[PDB]
Nucleic acid binder design. Structure first.
Lengths: 107, 107
RNA sequence: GCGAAUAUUCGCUU
RNA sequence: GCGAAUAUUCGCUU
């Protein structure tokens, strides 16, 4: 089960803000496993202003959309474009796609 | 964009029956393309009683769940288990998974 | 863990 | 169109 699945499954709210706050509450603080790389991340935040077509600056300095990144690097097609991105703070943050992340128990 | 994405995108309804009737109305009559095989099917019906863990009798007579079938035959992992199956009548019907089908314009 | 390339064999309505 | 096997080279926080 992916994080995107979890959003449309664990709680259903017709009020958009109530949906966004409850999903934000349910997810922030959970460890997620990416399907394309054996790495785990803590959900620090959910960025509703960004979607899979949003871009980021790579280590080599080139700008690519998340859609482009995961197709090129991992050959993972992001089908849903209306979803937000997950923020993970380390120590720039790692933006994660719900559709590309599994779930885990966490603190 | 997959059919499952479309369900959680095109119309949002807090009433479950109203959601199931409106999705049923929106989808029945559309051509869908499967991502794992270059084949297209008309949506004849949506079976809400069946999910990806439901089974079917193969041509060779062995019974397998849709989850097992698409992992073995096409190596396609169905993440969402709460979704229904799409019915397509030919000329037994072909049961299709929303998560594994793209969208098209159709009559 | 997901993939990419070349080569050779393969599986595929559900 | 999605894959499977063997072999050889590879890419990978975002």
């Amino acid at each position: 089960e992916t994080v995107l699945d979890f959003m449309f499954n664990f709680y259903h709210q017709t009020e958009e803000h109530k949906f966004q706050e409850q999903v934000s509450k349910e997810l922030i603080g959970l460890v997620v496993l990416t399907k394309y790389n054996n790495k785990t991340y803590r959900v620090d935040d959910i960025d509703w202003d960004q979607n899979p077509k949003s871009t980021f600056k790579k280590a080599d300095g080139s700008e690519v959309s998340f859609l482009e990144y995961y197709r090129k690097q991992y050959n993972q097609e992001i089908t849903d474009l209306k979803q937000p991105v997950l923020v993970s703070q380390p120590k720039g943050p790692a933006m994660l796609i719900p559709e590309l992340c599994y779930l885990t128990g966490l603190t």
